[PDB]
Design a protein around this ligand. Structure first.
Ligand SMILES: CC(C)CCC[C@@H](C)[C@H]1CC[C@H]2[C@@H]3CC=C4C[C@@H](OC(=O)CCC(=O)O)CC[C@]4(C)[C@H]3CC[C@]12C
Ligand SMILES: CC(C)CCC[C@@H](C)[C@H]1CC[C@H]2[C@@H]3CC=C4C[C@@H](OC(=O)CCC(=O)O)CC[C@]4(C)[C@H]3CC[C@]12C
Ligand SMILES: CC(C)CCC[C@@H](C)[C@H]1CC[C@H]2[C@@H]3CC=C4C[C@@H](OC(=O)CCC(=O)O)CC[C@]4(C)[C@H]3CC[C@]12C
Ligand SMILES: CC(C)CCC[C@@H](C)[C@H]1CC[C@H]2[C@@H]3CC=C4C[C@@H](OC(=O)CCC(=O)O)CC[C@]4(C)[C@H]3CC[C@]12C
Ligand SMILES: CC(C)CCC[C@@H](C)[C@H]1CC[C@H]2[C@@H]3CC=C4C[C@@H](OC(=O)CCC(=O)O)CC[C@]4(C)[C@H]3CC[C@]12C
Ligand SMILES: CC(C)CCC[C@@H](C)[C@H]1CC[C@H]2[C@@H]3CC=C4C[C@@H](OC(=O)CCC(=O)O)CC[C@]4(C)[C@H]3CC[C@]12C
Ligand SMILES: CC(C)CCC[C@@H](C)[C@H]1CC[C@H]2[C@@H]3CC=C4C[C@@H](OC(=O)CCC(=O)O)CC[C@]4(C)[C@H]3CC[C@]12C
Ligand SMILES: CC(C)CCC[C@@H](C)[C@H]1CC[C@H]2[C@@H]3CC=C4C[C@@H](OC(=O)CCC(=O)O)CC[C@]4(C)[C@H]3CC[C@]12C
Ligand SMILES: CC(C)CCC[C@@H](C)[C@H]1CC[C@H]2[C@@H]3CC=C4C[C@@H](OC(=O)CCC(=O)O)CC[C@]4(C)[C@H]3CC[C@]12C
Ligand SMILES: CC(C)CCC[C@@H](C)[C@H]1CC[C@H]2[C@@H]3CC=C4C[C@@H](OC(=O)CCC(=O)O)CC[C@]4(C)[C@H]3CC[C@]12C
Lengths: 310, 310, 310, 310, 310
């Protein structure tokens, strides 16, 4: 089934205008997708031995009595009054709930993208639909002029956007939340990887109620959480990748402000202003226009040779 | 399978004109969707140990006798004459039926949306289809006038709607029922989370009938409900999210009345009147009209620069 | 799997012209759909403990001998000569066949709708197709007259329908059968809910044939039907909903006769006559005509303001 | 199920313009696809005996005690304090994680192709769409001239590409990473195949905690990893194929530079320059143009017979 | 499930222009398809008894000790130091890996077809698309001439192909590899069928490590490979069919050279030259042309009666 997981989570896509930037979409796919793969691998039948916990019951216990001990101690992992270990009870909770914790990170990293799709993409879509179709008319006019010579509402409207700073707050906050959640996940995963491997072993007791006086039951059962060594291993993989995402996410703060007389071909940064976002989103969309490509071909020729000024 | 649950309930949509407001639809998706995820996680094989209850049968019992005790005590959870516990029998019922109780909340939170789709959306759809197509003619006429100058049935009909107050009662009652059900669910979930963790343990007896005289059977069996610690944990997650929905739902009462010379571009609140609903539903639909977008572009330019009055 | 059941039976639809009235279709979906959900929930793995019956075999019985007792007593539930209980054998039959009894109600409540689709909808469809297309011509003519002035075969044919009383008998009988089946189901479900919870316990004997003389076999085995407490619980849910459907179904008898100079816009009741049905079915279909909507807009304006008589 | 694996991974394709060269795509399909097949075959039910590990527990151990030993020793494979073997613990880790290691190679060999699809194919696609449609006009003009006689923007633009050397770095680095990962996989697989077959046997001890003093438990359990002989066998198959891919990948470094007055029919190598890539990508795409095929037919005739110069 | 296998592998097809000759495609479907069916039948539940190996453990061994012996001896089949048999260890390897060996033949017989689809079909497709459309013009002209009378680039181009001998090497080598692999499979299958039926029985020992001194374990366990009698039976079926394919494959060497003033209707062999391949591929494609069929009808009439010379 491991090969099906690779087909589902790596070799196929999951989770019109481009209303998300390619880098931001790519980071989201890695950040959300990787925990779901690692959860699926942690319980693959190739690696699983069929149970999360086993306890050494005495030889006199019947098969159902030993099955009770395993089931009770799986519940007792939450119940401080009936546990003992080389450390506190906290590792045992983390070892049990490791699958839910990775799922929680996957969800929390998806919510910023879902919010952008809910709260910002509809407005941006309606604007990009307008701006691109009017830019196409401007480019077709420029082509006809150049082709004849050598064989302003958009400008006004775009100049309004640098006054607005509306979407830039929605964008930067979506980036900033993604950064914080990745950083917190790195802190957790490095802690969980640091836990002693023998923190998977604990002592359990069933002598809570009517059993409390029964001399035939031993006072402590040795139990082991069988998958914990795999969980810690896969936590290192997740930590490595998330540490590599942190530089990329930080770069997405400065891509609008710096890194990416009015010019309708050269989209450029304009500061902490929505026009900087529209410049990014146009540059990832304007290349679909046939007329833009023709003018950029002429500009590249003029940059190298015959002076067909664009 | 946990990764499939995330794909099914988070990373894909489940449960023409927009006949429900985006916030109301979003709240419904969270309120109905979250219990179904949490039910599915509570019985995930990654976390389950294969049975809901285990009882400590004595060593002399055969395998089938011990299987009888577990099956009888699962039934006896409902049967006051054969239970004993540190508290009343009520916790044991809640621990058993936790999956049905979350399912009940999911259903009860869907019924207001289903009623709106049944009782109000058909009438509203027929009106919005009419109003938008006639508004498009008004806008196209205004564009042609403005483009020529600078390079009333709808008004009468809409003025009838502020007399009707028909749909506003259907809408506000759907909001109000959703509020009440979320509030009652919060009261339950906070109670269920408050129950002692050892309320998962109870004493069972099989000595009802012919077995009543059998000296070989112990008078009480120790039983434990194994999943209860997970149910209480997931109840905290559900309580947290529903407490965050309450402010959002309350805001949906005042969005029509306040928060959202006749003006065909600026849709506005008009009180406890159906025109306030039509203003909300138009504002979420009118942005699809090409002619509306052009006039709003001119209005934005006029707001910032050249006085092309819309 | 409980979440899949909710997706299948609540959050999605199951079981052109509208040839069934919305209320009648809605009642049918609830009446037929609810038993199928409740059956599915009664055997959900979240709530099931893997067997319907368990009997306490003695400790000397082998594993296969105890498996024989459970299998024999499941069959013996039908066989009066080998049962004993605190009451008659009738409860034990109902406890065993509870799933089939709910299935039987679901089927019997679907047959009236299936009969309407078989015996009445084809004729009604051919008439509504004719009447609506000729009404559209009448409305378009009235619009052109009104638009010019202020900027009869259908009547003859419809007047024939009030003489026919053909379909009204088919309709009312389909309603009446649905009422009777819901009422009988309420009587059963309230009886089944009233049965003592300990009617799930009975005494079984295997000493029929060659075993009759065997002194090593006990004369009675204690058996318990494990799911019965869930069946009675879910029977209360079904009883509550069906009791709420009864008022709605009764209202569907009087919707044609009363509640819903010839007027082609105001469809109205005409007594125990097929024209009353055609008036109901037109009123649920005529709103799709663009020309009808225009005339109703003018009528609403005339009702409030400028006297553009429709 | 083995026949389904062959259908899925051999007899069907998995993982517009041709934006990847056929040889590079073919190598990627083999390099990524083969580990996924071999993983799937290693756990086929035809060959599996249902468990990864078995340990010889003593005859006095109960069934659940022996199940504990197997589960503990599967976990102990990671835990140096409780292992002994004829060699170090490293082989035991490799034997356990063989499925993940092959999966890791499959992923690492896919990432270069995914990067090309992300970072280079969009720009190349926009250029090839332009260049081919303008070349089609040049060829149609040449056909009309030749057909009449015997019954420059593209040149300027392409001459800019040999100045750029932009895509050649992206391409060669994708090839170079693929080479390195295949070489490292060959080093691992030849090492893993070289491990002694009896490295699948190790000695395990459960005497860690409360069990440490128990005289009834033997100090060492003999355990065997059952699948290891299959893993080493399939590692030889993977090593053989990857060794055959190495010559092919190396050839893909020199295909642009050498091996593959301006001529619009004969695409040719131009050095370490992007024009060399465009020449390769055009030659794999230009054959779709009807006008190119006609001119190549005339060129082939002129090469053999009547001098219809192309 | 056997009936599903027949539906999947016999009664349905698996694995535009015809770019493979019908006989060559048919041989490939049999040669590749038959092993996959026979593998699937060898493990059908109708015939399988649920395990590949069973060993006779002594009566004192616990259930888990006997499960260890079976699992160890399945691994020991590869491990010469712990086997004994009436012959060498080679039969035991073949009995274990019979499913992989048949899979290997299925794959090796598919690779020649995959290579033809990769390396030759694209060029041939581009030529056949050209040649057929120009032949259609020649035939339509000949029809119009004949219909009027009685109520050369292609020739030049095709005459170039007999100089090329390019594709004939690719074709004959694909045929020759298919012949060699079928012949080698026949040699193996006849050997494997010849092995003694009691070669499925071998003696196993677990006394490798700590167990080496244990006097309670017998020195040899009798083991039997349960499916081997089915594998040898199905090997006879595979051998019979492959022996019948050998004559057909050999005939495909001489179909181009012999067996199958320029004539545009009668495609004919021209020696070891690509024109011989084009003649074969045209003859399997030219019959789709309406104009060809008309001329062949006239030729058949002229062959029998009225002299309408084609
Ligand atoms: C043992 C350790 C030290 C080796 C080095 C770390 C690897 C295990 C890391 C490095 C890059 C990682 C990969 C980076 C990107 C992806 C793609 C991601 O899928 C997508 O983003 C899909 C994108 C699309 O389809 O558009 C799934 C996880 C995966 C394979 C990551 C899995 C883990 C990888 C291979
Ligand atoms: C289902 C998904 C979407 C959410 C999963 C959330 C859980 C992974 C969280 C919620 C509640 C958390 C627990 C709340 C309470 C505790 C007890 C607390 O215990 C101690 O400090 C014990 C110290 C001692 O041993 O004395 C440590 C954190 C822990 C385990 C938390 C660990 C993480 C948990 C299980
Ligand atoms: C351990 C606790 C203290 C951490 C904080 C609480 C989280 C567990 C909460 C906060 C927000 C919650 C999420 C808010 C919104 C959604 C979306 C919801 O899906 C949809 O609404 C789909 C919408 C669409 O697809 O259009 C499913 C539940 C989920 C993931 C919620 C799951 C639980 C979350 C992550
Ligand atoms: C299948 C879905 C759609 C609906 C599920 C509904 C149930 C979750 C409801 C319906 C009937 C309810 C029960 C009706 C009767 C009782 C007994 C009652 O018992 C006591 O008060 C016991 C006190 C004592 O111990 O003396 C407490 C509430 C309880 C468990 C209720 C809990 C919630 C139940 C099970
Ligand atoms: C514990 C008791 C006392 C609480 C109160 C009773 C509820 C359990 C009842 C009240 C309304 C009932 C619901 C009324 C309507 C429906 C819709 C029905 O589905 C449809 O009719 C689908 C309609 C469509 O999709 O068009 C399925 C049963 C359900 C959820 C019913 C399930 C049981 C509900 C929630
Ligand atoms: C498969 C679906 C579509 C139909 C299911 C129909 C059953 C649920 C019906 C048909 C025959 C009925 C039974 C016919 C005979 C009997 C025996 C009869 O027994 C007594 O009166 C016993 C009195 C005593 O204990 O002395 C009570 C009704 C009962 C159980 C009936 C209960 C309901 C049954 C099982
Ligand atoms: C026992 C050993 C010594 C025999 C010789 C080695 C074989 C086991 C090798 C030689 C060629 C290999 C094959 C080369 C190519 C492929 C195609 C590959 O699938 C694709 O590339 C799909 C291509 C497409 O569909 O476009 C899957 C692996 C496979 C069958 C390889 C499987 C292993 C093979 C048969
Ligand atoms: C889930 C997929 C995508 C990634 C799988 C990565 C693993 C296969 C890697 C990551 C960590 C690696 C391990 C990290 C630590 C060790 C311990 C180390 O131990 C010794 O050197 C023991 C020497 C002794 O016996 O004294 C040898 C390498 C090994 C097994 C490594 C083998 C390969 C592992 C398991
Ligand atoms: C017991 C022995 C001595 C009887 C004689 C041998 C048969 C078992 C052989 C003779 C012909 C064989 C068949 C020849 C052709 C085919 C078709 C082949 O499927 C295809 O080629 C599909 C073709 C398509 O669908 O286009 C699958 C194997 C099968 C049924 C072969 C199965 C084995 C058969 C029946
Ligand atoms: C997974 C698919 C695609 C490929 C399957 C390939 C195997 C079926 C091949 C590869 C390695 C081969 C084995 C390599 C080594 C040996 C040991 C060799 O042993 C002896 O000669 C033993 C003599 C003695 O008993 O003393 C005999 C051939 C054999 C079993 C070979 C049989 C066929 C094998 C298992």
């Amino acid at each position: 089934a491991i090969a099906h997981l690779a087909t589902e989570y790596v070799f196929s896509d999951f989770l019109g205008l481009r209303l998300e930037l390619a880098v931001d979409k790519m980071v989201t796919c890695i950040a959300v997708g990787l925990p779901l793969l690692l959860i699926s691998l942690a319980f693959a039948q190739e690696i699983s031995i069929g149970t999360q916990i086993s306890c050494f019951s005495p030889s006199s216990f019947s098969w159902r009595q030993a099955a009770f001990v395993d089931s009770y101690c799986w519940a007792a992992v939450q119940q401080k009054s009936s546990l003992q270990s080389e450390s506190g009870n906290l590792p045992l909770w983390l070892h049990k709930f490791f699958p839910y914790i990775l799922l929680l990170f996957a969800i929390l990293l998806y919510l910023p993208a879902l919010f952008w799709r809910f709260s910002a993409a509809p407005h941006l879509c309606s604007d990009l639909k307008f701006i691109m179709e009017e830019l196409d008319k401007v480019y077709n006019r420029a082509i006809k002029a150049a082709k004849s010579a050598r064989d302003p509402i958009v400008e006004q409207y775009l100049k309004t956007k640098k006054n607005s700073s509306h979407l830039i707050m929605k964008y930067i906050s979506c980036r900033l939340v993604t950064f914080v959640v990745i950083l917190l996940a790195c802190i957790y995963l490095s802690y969980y990887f640091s836990l002693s491997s023998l923190s998977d072993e604990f002592l359990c007791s069933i002598k809570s109620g009517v059993l409390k006086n029964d001399s035939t039951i031993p006072d402590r059962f040795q139990c082991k959480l069988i998958a914990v060594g795999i969980f810690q291993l896969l936590s290192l993989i997740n930590l490595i990748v998330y540490a590599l995402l942190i530089p990329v996410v930080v770069y997405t703060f400065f891509i609008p402000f710096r890194q990416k007389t009015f010019d309708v071909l050269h989209f450029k940064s304009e500061g902490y202003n929505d026009l900087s976002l529209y410049n990014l989103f146009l540059e990832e969309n304007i290349s679909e226009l046939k007329s833009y490509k023709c003018l950029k071909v002429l500009e590249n020729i003029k940059s190298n040779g015959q002076g067909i000024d664009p």
